[PDB]
Amino acid sequence: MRKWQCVVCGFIYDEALGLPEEGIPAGTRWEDIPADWVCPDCGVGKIDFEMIE
Amino acid sequence: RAPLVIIGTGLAGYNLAREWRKLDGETPLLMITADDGRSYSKPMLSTGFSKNKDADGLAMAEPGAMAEQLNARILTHTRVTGIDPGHQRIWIGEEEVRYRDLVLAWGAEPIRVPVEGDAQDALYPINDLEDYARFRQAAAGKRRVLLLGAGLIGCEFANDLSSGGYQLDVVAPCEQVMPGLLHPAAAKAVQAGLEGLGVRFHLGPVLASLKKAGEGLEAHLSDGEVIPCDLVVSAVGLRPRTELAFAAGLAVNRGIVVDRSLRTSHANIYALGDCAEVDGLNLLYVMPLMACARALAQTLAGNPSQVAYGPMPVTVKTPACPLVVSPPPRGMDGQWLVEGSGTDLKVLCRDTAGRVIGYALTGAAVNEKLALNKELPGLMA
Ligand SMILES: Cc1cc2nc3c(=O)[nH]c(=O)nc-3n(C[C@H](O)[C@H](O)[C@H](O)COP(=O)(O)OP(=O)(O)OC[C@H]3O[C@@H](n4cnc5c(N)ncnc54)[C@H](O)[C@@H]3O)c2cc1C
Ligand SMILES: [Fe+3]
Incomplete structure (x- = not known):
């Protein structure tokens, strides 16, 4: 499990938790999140996220 | 070509x-x-x-x-x-x-405010990376910052500058933080959070003058308060260029x-x-x-294409008091009702039909962003 942070607003996606209301299950890896998915807080693409821990 | x-x-x-x-x-x-x-x-x-x-x-x-x-x-x-x-x-x-x-x-341009005195130009806007560099340059080795403005941008800086070690005095003639954007009760909670960090608010007055005094500056407010400071951040607001x-x-x-x-x-x-x-x-x-x-x-x-805004809630970056706000879209009326207590406030705006059209969430209450977002109408119909 890894944490990915939006380089634009600081939104943290946590692989351990997922985003079940998006809806993305707990334990979903960053690569297995749909390509079209955007940051819920600022709306940038997956390209603007970086793995922090 | x-x-x-x-x-x-x-x-x-x-x-x-x-x-x-x-x-x-x-x-x-x-x-x-x-x-x-x-x-x-x-x-x-x-x-x-x-x-x-x-x-x-x-x-x-x-x-x-x-x-x-x-x-x-x-x-x-x-x-x-x-x-x-x-x-x-x-x-x-x-x-x-x-x-x-x-x-x-x-982009947009900072809103200027009239200031008198021999230091009336020592006001630092922070509207890009170079502005930030010029503010950090001027703030090195200093203790006290006066900040003009009490909107979202002013509140975020006041929070970060305080975590950065500075002692903040926020001055703004508006009656609450984030006026227009925020319901009074949720603004009050955010202001309380920032005060908990040591930020001192002066809501109602303006900066009358700024003078060189000894080691730094003296800010004379319109109500006669004199506030010693090292530099001034101008974050009154923005208007499109x-x-x-x-x-x-x-x-x-x-x-x-x-x-x-x-x-x-x-x-x-x-x-x-x-x-x-x-x-x-x-x-x-x-x-x-x-x-x-x-x-x-x-x-x-x-490929001729149009935009169509869905709900676009605002996430305010004040760690001292977490806040998410979604004002009701223009042309829609409703009554505001304050649920929750203290720092964990849930202020909902409901139409006559009972539907949530707008909200403000502080503290713990921000967790229910996602459930409320589903009910929300778009900014464009
Ligand atoms: C402190 C702060 C925090 C913020 N936090 C958030 C947030 O958390 N979430 C959020 O959604 N929004 C936030 N915002 C707002 C968000 O940052 C802006 O909406 C967004 O950055 C605007 O981008 P822009 O490209 O339209 O404008 P800008 O970033 O201002 O870019 C304008 C560009 O035009 C150039 N330019 C201007 N005039 C000329 C000229 N005449 N000739 C040549 N070039 C020119 C400038 O050099 C600049 O490159 C924040 C704003 C501030 C200041
Ligand atoms: Fe983001």
Whole structure:
């Protein structure tokens, strides 16, 4: 499990938790999140996220 | 031969360029900016201290590197001084540039406030990375900052500057923090959070004068308070940059008037981001700007596309009191009711039918963002 942070607003996606209301299950890896998915807080693409821990 | 010309290397200009380059990799692209042209996310300016970043730490890429990624020529420290819509060109002093289509992504300008005294010019706006660098330069080794303004931007800086070790005095003539955006009760909780960090508020007065006194400055407020400080941040607010568009005969209102396709009143000129008023909606945030870049890219590449804003809640970056606010869309009325207690407040706006159309959430109550978002109406119907 890894944490990915939006380089634009600081939104943290946590692989351990997922985003079940998006809806993305707990334990979903960053690569297995749909390509079209955007940051819920600022709306940038997956390209603007970086793995922090 | 004829380039797409984008004025701006903010998030609007760079995201448009990127979204467009997925669609057209042949047409020449020219980007023009008055700043150093470095890629960086403006939202992060208000978190620099808590992340122990300086200005250079916030830069993600040099303009030369962006120029390679986007197959573009990028002119940095270059001020566009006019638009000539009748001849499809723009001015840079006494040099000109022809365009195929022009994109105005040149943002918003800080709101000035009148100040007297022999130090009346020592006010530091923070509206880009170079501003942030000039503020950090002036703040090194200092203790006290006076901050003018009490909106979202002023509140974020006051929070970060306090975490960074500075003692803040916030001055604003408005009656609450984040007026217009925020229900009084939730504003009160946010203000309390910031005070808990040591921020001192002066709501009602203005800065009358600023004078050099001993080791630094003395700020004389309009109510007669004298506040010793080392420097002053001017974060009163922002208004879209319209001067050059209006002089060129483009329709302006609050910002540059564009339709849902982002086209101005003139053929071959578009506008997006902080400078643009999209179908009556000038929204100085990233979410609508991203929707606009995606749609305008399509149009520029020959696939006429429109934006249609869904709900776009605002996430305010005040760690001392977490806040998410979604004001009701324009043309909609409802009653406000304050649920929760203390710092964990849930203020809901409901129409006559009982449906949640707007909200403000503080403290713990921000967790229920996602459930409330599903009920929300769009900013565009
Ligand atoms: C402290 C702070 C925190 C923020 N936090 C958030 C947040 O958390 N979430 C969110 O959604 N929004 C946030 N915002 C708002 C968000 O940052 C802006 O909406 C967004 O960055 C605007 O991007 P832009 O490209 O349209 O404008 P800008 O970033 O201002 O870019 C304008 C560009 O045009 C160039 N330019 C201007 N005039 C000329 C000229 N005449 N000639 C040549 N070039 C010119 C400038 O150099 C610049 O490159 C925040 C804003 C501030 C200041
Ligand atoms: Fe984000």
